[PDB]
Structures are given as C-alpha cells and as structure tokens.
C-alpha cells in the first residue's frame, strides 16, 4: 500500500513514455 502506491503513480507515468516513442515514429516517417 505504502510502497505499492508509488508503483501505481509510476505505471501511469512511465506509460506515456512508451506512447512518446510511438509518437515520434509517426512524425519520423
């Protein structure tokens, strides 16, 4: 709960990073 709570915040914070990689590809080609 305590240390696991931060795990949820990181899950929604890291996800966008992956979306970015897909966002750069669209403009790359």
From Swiss-Prot:
Changing residue 19 to D: No effect on the biosynthesis of the secreted form. It is found in: Golgi apparatus membrane. Induction: Induced by IFNG treatment in monocytes (in vitro). Signal peptide: none annotated. The chain crosses the membrane at residues 4-20. Changing residue 20 to D: No effect on the biosynthesis of the secreted form. N-glycosylated. A secreted form is released from the membrane after cleavage by gamma-secretase. Belongs to the glycosyltransferase 18 family. Catalyzes the addition of N-acetylglucosamine (GlcNAc) in beta 1-6 linkage to the alpha-linked mannose of biantennary N-linked oligosaccharides. Catalyzes an important step in the biosynthesis of branched, complex-type N-glycans, such as those found on EGFR, TGFR (TGF-beta receptor) and CDH2. Via its role in the biosynthesis of complex N-glycans, plays an important role in the activation of cellular signaling pathways, reorganization of the actin cytoskeleton, cell-cell adhesion and cell migration. This is Alpha-1,6-mannosylglycoprotein 6-beta-N-acetylglucosaminyltransferase A. The gene is MGAT5. The chain holds residues 13 to 37 of 741 of the full protein.
């Amino acid at each position: 709960k305590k240390k696991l709570g931060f795990f949820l915040v990181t899950f929604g914070f890291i996800w966008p990073m992956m979306l970015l990689h897909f966002t750069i590809q669209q403009r790359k080609k």
